[PDB]
């Protein structure tokens, strides 16, 4: 039992009992969410391809925590033109735990 | 164990003295003394006295037999250098450096 879900402009291949980091969601920690955008669910030897989306499928997840990724560091340098900038960035994420997949 | 013996301000360059130190590192103090007694180099004359003092230190201060020791550690460091003047042709002057070194040897029965 694995499924493919769309969240945060990206698609994730997911199995139950999995921890993964996705884009930031506006859900409080310890709460449950659902994904009604399922493109493919596969059960053992049977695969259910999703015409646009699989009709009648859902994936349930529980929001675990929030955080920021490690700092990436930006520099903009133009040689012998007397120009230099500099910046830093940490990207917010949301960690979820997948608790159920149904066909 | 691990008895040491240091000689500071030995009147020789560190590069010259490190060739002899690489010959005795790891050997037994019995076959390491013969290697230094018959060496043609000058640093082997100086380093043969540092090694024989670390052996005596391991005897009087610690009560250990010579037959059990070995040269566990030896290294050469740099020391204070004297600066002189060498007159060259057409009135030029040059800086002469008279280097020294610190020789340290350690022996251990283990």
């Amino acid at each position: 039992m694995y499924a493919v879900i769309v969240t945060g402009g990206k698609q994730h291949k997911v199995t139950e009992g999995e921890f993964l980091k996705v884009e930031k969601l506006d859900v409080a920690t310890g709460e449950a969410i659902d994904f009604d955008r399922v493109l493919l669910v596969a059960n053992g030897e049977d695969v259910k391809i999703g015409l646009p989306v699989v009709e009648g499928a859902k994936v349930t997840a529980e929001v675990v925590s929030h955080g920021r990724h490690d700092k990436v560091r930006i520099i903009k340098f133009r040689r012998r033109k007397h120009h230099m900038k500099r910046q830093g960035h940490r990207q917010w994420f949301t960690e979820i735990k997948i608790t159920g997949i149904q066909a | 164990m691990e008895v040491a013996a240091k000689l500071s301000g030995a009147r020789i360059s560190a590069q010259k003295a490190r060739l002899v130190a690489d010959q005795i590192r790891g050997k037994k103090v019995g076959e390491a003394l013969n290697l230094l007694a018959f060496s043609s180099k000058k640093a082997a004359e100086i380093m043969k006295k540092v090694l024989e003092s670390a052996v005596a230190n391991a005897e009087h201060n610690e009560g250990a037999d010579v037959d059990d020791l070995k040269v566990s550690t030896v290294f050469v460091n740099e020391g204070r250098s004297l600066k002189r003047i060498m007159p060259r042709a057409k009135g030029r002057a040059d800086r002469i450096v008279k280097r020294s070194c610190h020789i340290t040897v350690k022996v251990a029965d283990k």
Binding site: - | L19, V20, D22, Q23, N34, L35, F38, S39, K41
Partner: protein
């Protein structure tokens, strides 16, 4: 003629890889038990069981 760029640490240490020293061939005077150079007179004055310099 002189260098255009200074040599590195590794570049000069590779040149010194052929600068190691060899050890002499020693031997033990069987009659006495004194270590000497191979084919030389002992530092005491024995060669092949024969006193030759009477100190």
């Amino acid at each position: 003629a002189v260098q255009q760029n200074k040599k590195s640490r590794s570049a000069r240490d590779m040149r010194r890889s052929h600068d190691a020293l060899e050890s002499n061939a020693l031997s033990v005077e069987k009659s006495t038990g004194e270590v000497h150079l191979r084919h030389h007179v002992s530092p005491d004055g024995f060669y092949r069981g024969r006193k030759v310099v009477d100190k």
